[PDB]
Write a protein that binds this ligand. Sequence first.
Ligand SMILES: *[C@@H]1O[C@H](CO)[C@@H](O)[C@H](O)[C@H]1NC(C)=O
Ligand SMILES: *[C@@H]1O[C@H](CO)[C@@H](O)[C@H](O)[C@H]1NC(C)=O
Ligand SMILES: *[C@@H]1O[C@H](CO)[C@@H](O)[C@H](O)[C@H]1NC(C)=O
Ligand SMILES: *[C@@H]1O[C@H](CO)[C@@H](O)[C@H](O)[C@H]1NC(C)=O
Lengths: 774, 774
Amino acid sequence: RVVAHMPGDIIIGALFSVHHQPTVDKVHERKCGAVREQYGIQRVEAMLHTLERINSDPTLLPNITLGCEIRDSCWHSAVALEQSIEFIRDSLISSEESFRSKKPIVGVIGPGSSSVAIQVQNLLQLFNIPQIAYSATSMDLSDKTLFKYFMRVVPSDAQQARAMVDIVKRYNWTYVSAVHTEGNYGESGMEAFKDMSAKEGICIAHSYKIYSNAGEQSFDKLLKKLTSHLPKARVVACFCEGMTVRGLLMAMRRLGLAGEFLLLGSDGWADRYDVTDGYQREAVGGITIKLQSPDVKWFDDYYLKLRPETNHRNPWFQEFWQHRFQCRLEGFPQENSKYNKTCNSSLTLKTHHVQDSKMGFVINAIYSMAYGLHNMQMSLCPGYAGLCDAMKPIDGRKLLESLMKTNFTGVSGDTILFDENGDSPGRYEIMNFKEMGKDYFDYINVGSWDNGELKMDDDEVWSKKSNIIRSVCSEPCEKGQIKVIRKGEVSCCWTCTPCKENEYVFDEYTCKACQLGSWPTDDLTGCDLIPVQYLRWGDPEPIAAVVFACLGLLATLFVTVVFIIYRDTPVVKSSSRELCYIILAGICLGYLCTFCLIAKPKQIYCYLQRIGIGLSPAMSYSALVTKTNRIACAQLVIAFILICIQLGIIVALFIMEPPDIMHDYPSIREVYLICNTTNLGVVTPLGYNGLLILSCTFYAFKTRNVPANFNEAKYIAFTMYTTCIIWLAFVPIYFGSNYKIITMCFSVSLSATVALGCMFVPKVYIILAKPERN
Amino acid sequence: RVVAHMPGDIIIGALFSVHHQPTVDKVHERKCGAVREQYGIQRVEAMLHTLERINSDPTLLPNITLGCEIRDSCWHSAVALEQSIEFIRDSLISSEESFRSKKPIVGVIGPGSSSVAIQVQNLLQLFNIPQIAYSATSMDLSDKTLFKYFMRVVPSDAQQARAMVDIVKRYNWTYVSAVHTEGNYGESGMEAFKDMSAKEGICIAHSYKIYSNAGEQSFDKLLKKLTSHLPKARVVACFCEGMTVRGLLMAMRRLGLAGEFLLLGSDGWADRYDVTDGYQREAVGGITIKLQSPDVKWFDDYYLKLRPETNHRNPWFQEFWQHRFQCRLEGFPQENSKYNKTCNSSLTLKTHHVQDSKMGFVINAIYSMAYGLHNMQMSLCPGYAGLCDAMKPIDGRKLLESLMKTNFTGVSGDTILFDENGDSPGRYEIMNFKEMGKDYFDYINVGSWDNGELKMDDDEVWSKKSNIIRSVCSEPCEKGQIKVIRKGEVSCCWTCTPCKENEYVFDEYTCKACQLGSWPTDDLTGCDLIPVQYLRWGDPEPIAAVVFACLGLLATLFVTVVFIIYRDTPVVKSSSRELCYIILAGICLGYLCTFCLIAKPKQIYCYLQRIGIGLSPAMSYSALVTKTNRIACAQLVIAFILICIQLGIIVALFIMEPPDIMHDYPSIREVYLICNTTNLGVVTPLGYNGLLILSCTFYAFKTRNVPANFNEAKYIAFTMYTTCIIWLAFVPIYFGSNYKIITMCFSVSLSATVALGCMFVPKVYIILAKPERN
Ligand SMILES: *[C@@H]1O[C@H](CO)[C@@H](O)[C@H](O)[C@H]1NC(C)=O
Ligand SMILES: *[C@@H]1O[C@H](CO)[C@@H](O)[C@H](O)[C@H]1NC(C)=O
Ligand SMILES: *[C@@H]1O[C@H](CO)[C@@H](O)[C@H](O)[C@H]1NC(C)=O
Ligand SMILES: *[C@@H]1O[C@H](CO)[C@@H](O)[C@H](O)[C@H]1NC(C)=O
């Protein structure tokens, strides 16, 4: 086993993926693969020069030299576990005390794979050793109930899903499709995405849990299933890997459905143009995310000046010079005979210098542990250059307490701050694969994201407002009368359903209905009451009844001259001078019933309208049948008792029925203004009227041969044969249409006008028209 | 560091609590405590002699020597973790390859504490090393989703709670109280107990989460809160430790409430008479549980023959001889000067030989790994004495597969079988602290439990059937009429609520009600229909109507002699000979209405009863008013038309009302048998009868001065003044009580009998009684 070592006071180890992973036949022999350049030796020399800088910077840890013990991880779980066993036994022999030098391992950094770091944490919890990673992105590692000693200077995939939710939230897109690859990277990220999409109502058609190496027929079936949701969903969010997006683009070329689907993605194709290699006509318009990766000139100047004759601190730098430049440095102690060519002295290092994209994150973690130890020194050893007895030795409980509450500016100047879950906030970059002038598109920048701060250039993409259409299931309905209704599939496939004419829009998926006599406004906001009728205007239908009542009241005073002044003429002396007066008064009240009925409906006017309908034919017929019965001192008594019968009947009716003003409801849009007119109160005086008129007809048919009072009985019979038709035809016309005022003002005045013009007008025809018997 | 080592082919380590646990000032210096005799060196020598026996037994692993590497655990988590780091680096240097001997650690046994084994498993999962414990009882360790490489030859606390549920289930106890101490032993066991008690409806008053070192005032408050549930709950189940039970007994002595509470417990006071030390008057009757602990003579014979001059294999046996017998063996290499006295040569070892109670479980785990390796040898190296290339090397995946499906007989002969959770089933012992003849009680055996097999001696405890009363909230209710009802607190505090007289017991907490005309049986099982009345017996109330109808039918033929035979006498020649015949026929039908009404209600009999009630006074009165009107060829026509009027009326009634047989419901317990008798069908013939009788009375009052037919009109008027009272008083008596058959059979026959005896009997009084005008 090899180790790169730095001496010092506090030694902080690391696990870097120097070699490639071993195969299935090397899991027991631990034969690691070839040396990985970017993830490996670059991070090693970066940590070496970073601790050389931190030992040379007296701002933090002034009289404390921070050494290191760099051991390989080989990208595999078991080898990293073996080197962590080496770390912990070095810590234990330092605690207890050939190679008697002690080295208490305090912290350790790495490795890259989250599937390996999740194994390393289960070893490091037991030993009070905190560990800060730089490439683990799995969100289950945030659970410090299980993973207490795991901290990250990188954001999780949950904050990738957060930004993927936020960019859709900014673009007002609701019914979208989203796929994800199999594994802990895809599944957890899609779970966080669908958990945060429900906070904005963003619908998901169907998640397609595809595999990392699915077949071309399987990818074509997934593309057909995605097209089955089109055109209702256009944006496809793939929290997935780069080979997933490459297989989807292979399916888009093999299906020929390019230029339609919008492909949102995670950092699997962040700068990976090899995913869109040769697929630039199909990949256009896609939006991905990427961590901010600034290039640090510190490691550049510290790394381009390295030579194998100088860099003897790294025990595999000479092997890296041997294998990576494919030459045989025979003077080097790592002189391998596998390379046939020799190493020239002018063989430079600046050729193809492409450093790690995650280079700044390693230095961020190193400075995180550095300022954590500086906070420990400032908290426990106040005003001291080195370390006092409170830091002799150092366990990880108060070290975790110090690292949890740290804050500084990194190599990018980023304010590195740790939450309660021990995670740095996300600071991403947003790009587009927009087409250039020629047929060569690139991942061009369209802005960035930082913890909610979503700086975007909407004018950059589509070059206008003519974007991809809003991926939504239901359009917004016509909110004046039509309302939405859920079908039962998603929260955005609403159905534009109109509501009733008496139902206003109250809820977003329901209409409340107005009550009887109420109907909504023009915006379906509330309700409005329909107005009622005053029933007194120049309306041509009741004005005939008004003119007819005026003619009756004029004819009353026309008749009233030739017997009140002529009260001594023997034509009227033999006639009944009180009974005909009572009959004329009843006819006058029957004329006044027209004015009492066609008026304003009030608490007194309805009672004054309803008191006369029973009485005015009754007192007109009572004196008539009283005079008819005698065909010697009860002449004003029998008719008075017959009037008092109907008086008692109408008083007993009005005791049971108080005067009320109701509203007739012929429909939902018409509200009238009626009185307290019940069927009992209609029929009960009609029964007494029918009892009077049949007895009067039976008496007139018997006494129709009385010539007295200048043919009085003939005129009586001629009046009664007309009234027996009128008071019989009154019933169906009143019980038919809604003319309960109009027919009432017509027919009662008509009956009184007949009882005038066929009884009293022929009685004065031999008086006024014939002045011989005035 | 020290280690006890056995050479061999397959080396299986162990972690035994040899020393006592270090203090708070020795967690960094690892200064372990004094040597623990029972849990420590006894288990060490047991494993040494057990592997010596297994190497000498050619039944399993014939040409394989099973060595060991015994390292201390010191009862503390960190020291056991350090020695496990030593184990895994020994495994790694054996995998890779001064002291160049390799030793691949395959399995490891222990330690005792579950709180330490839960730390050791998080280290051993990462390395494919299975581990079998012998004292860990925590039930969260059964979760092999998290704890895949942890197996037990001991049952969990869940199977303690299972037996504590089962003994209560056998004793039919429902509303009990249960307390538990704080910690993972008490809390998980109480959670499993309350989870399994809900499978039997066993109520729990309130769990009292007390602490291990609660105050005496706190224990008195807990005792008062437990007495607050008394006497409704008597048995107290304490899945707790021994100091908990000792504190509860201190509270019982300080409160003086002894001799009442039943104390069920776990193995915290299994053989711990120090809990009940001096508390034997208060602790009587309590039931605890204990694992079966047989004494193995193998370790006895292998351990009593040990000497420090011989046992040089154990590197701390000489220190155990130094400290445990408090003498200074100066010739021994562990000659400590702390002991002033010297070691005699006759100083024996058999004095106070009290071995471990869990001694057999260690040997069970050793034989479990032995037969697992034997199953591996039989599965991978068939017919081979040693090990083939399939067992070179050996990881723990297929070793776990072999250990999961093992079965053998242990040192006690117990069939050790592992479930899907990797746990041995429980095989307990049940004891009681029953009083002896003197005042010295002991933990006497009352049976055992083995995976459901609950062998108990009920005659042993209480010496009779007079036991502790069943701890229940509600007694079983009187199930004849009274039903239970839940109050809303527990599933056993039911309230004995009676139900209605028409409601039968259907549910255990609800009564279903019978319908109208139905009422339950004597056991409230279903419903029963009430019988109806036939209304024809020797009942004294309708038999008067029957005798009266017979007298009427006799008087009909009494009258029918003196005018049918005497059809030429001029007394009856001037009288109406057809009209009086029609009247007599109507009286005969009115007499027949009594027989038609008081009969069996059928579809024809109800119609025949209801056809005559309208017709029989109508045809009797029609000829009467027809003869009365003439006071010349329509004499049989006018009365016929008046009969046909009522005929048409009753046909129009029976068209609207078909003949139906209904059931009168005067109450919920009485169902009668009536016909289709509606109020319309009652009033409508009564109106025609009233129209007839008033016209007949008005005609008789005018024609009461007609002396013809030997004073006929006087008898007519005298009949009519009686019928005007009868047919007017018929209405309230019929509209009052439930005599709709009785009054109908009375009054119609009474009216016909009056119309006979005041009209025709005086008409024949001058015929039969006076034979001069026969
Ligand atoms: C919703 O997002 C679209 C994105 O193109 C934008 O044009 C529109 O103005 C947004 N709606 C509102 C109300 O801002
Ligand atoms: C880190 O953040 C906290 C709160 O956000 C602030 O009080 C502190 O000053 C910051 N650290 C530095 C070095 O500014
Ligand atoms: C428990 O209940 C069963 C059910 O009837 C009964 O047979 C048994 O005798 C009961 N046991 C005791 C101890 O009451
Ligand atoms: C162990 O149990 C299984 C099933 O219960 C049985 O088939 C097997 O024979 C048993 N082992 C022995 C040694 O009897």
